[PDB]
Design a protein around this ligand. Structure first.
Ligand SMILES: *P(=O)(O)[C@@H](c1ccc(O)cc1)N1C[C@H](NC(=O)[C@H](N)c2ccc(O)cc2)C1=O
Ligand SMILES: [Ca+2]
Ligand SMILES: [Ca+2]
Length: 227
């Protein structure tokens, strides 16, 4: 229902990708022909479009998703990741799974930020609406209403989540936006939290990484990070 598998007959490995802040794993579908020999398990938010029975914490969402992953891929080692918010969820999943004794060989953070380290800007909903308008999404259409609520709830879960230290291998893919700024620190991470980290550049803007025109570069960055 909310777990979809692309390239299900592939024999080259498996990757689990968690939806970004807008709640749907649809942007990952374009990866299938670029990673045709990787089974891609893509998770969407089962509460998308609902106002009730929301997750109370990011850790609860991660726990549900770990159950899904274990049903889909009962044997490790596991490779987990996600774009933006999805990466943060993947981190918590990896943490939980590694504490239970599962092997997580790769954690993929595609331009993920740690908003728990960030200052409160302005009104949260006003900010989400303004950003959606800038992205050409109508915030008062029905789809827009669902997406606004999704971004609001996932952003608040992320801001509440204080990430743990994670000792497994982590790949952080970063857009070319930092310059002399440290790319790890600028996203609210540090090497005490992520001691085994490789930073991979990926071209394009945060929002456009899974556009058709960027998918090939992004897939190359993913492939390099995984091997
Ligand atoms: P991502 O899934 O796109 C991630 C994100 C986007 C851009 C950044 O610079 C950093 C992270 N997103 C989208 C989602 N929601 C928000 O970021 C909201 N602005 C938000 C944030 C925090 C609260 O409390 C409420 C709303 C998120 O985490
Ligand atoms: Ca408001
Ligand atoms: Ca290219």
């Amino acid at each position: 229902a909310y777990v979809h598998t692309l390239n299900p007959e592939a024999t080259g490995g498996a990757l689990v990708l968690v939806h970004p802040g807008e709640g749907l794993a649809l942007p990952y579908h374009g990866l299938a022909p670029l990673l045709p020999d990787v089974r891609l398990h893509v998770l969407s938010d089962p509460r998308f479009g609902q106002s009730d029975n929301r997750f109370a914490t990011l850790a609860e969402m991660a726990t549900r998703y770990v159950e899904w992953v274990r049903t889909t891929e009962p044997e490790g080692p596991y490779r987990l990741g996600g774009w933006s918010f999805g990466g943060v969820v993947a981190l918590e999943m990896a943490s939980q799974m590694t504490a239970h004794g599962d092997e997580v060989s790769d954690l993929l953070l595609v331009d993920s930020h740690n908003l728990n380290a960030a200052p409160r800007t302005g009104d949260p909903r006003e900010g989400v609406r303004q950003r959606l308008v800038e992205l050409g999404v109508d915030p008062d259409s029905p789809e827009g209403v669902d997406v606004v609520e999704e971004l609001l709830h996932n952003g608040a879960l992320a801001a509440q989540y204080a990430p743990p230290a994670y000792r497994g291998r982590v790949s952080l893919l970063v857009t070319p936006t930092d310059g002399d700024r440290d790319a790890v620190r600028a996203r609210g991470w540090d090497r005490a939290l992520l001691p085994d980290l490789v930073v991979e550049p990926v071209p394009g803007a945060h929002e456009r990484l899974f556009d058709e025109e960027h998918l090939s570069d992004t897939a190359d960055a993913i492939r390099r990070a995984l091997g």
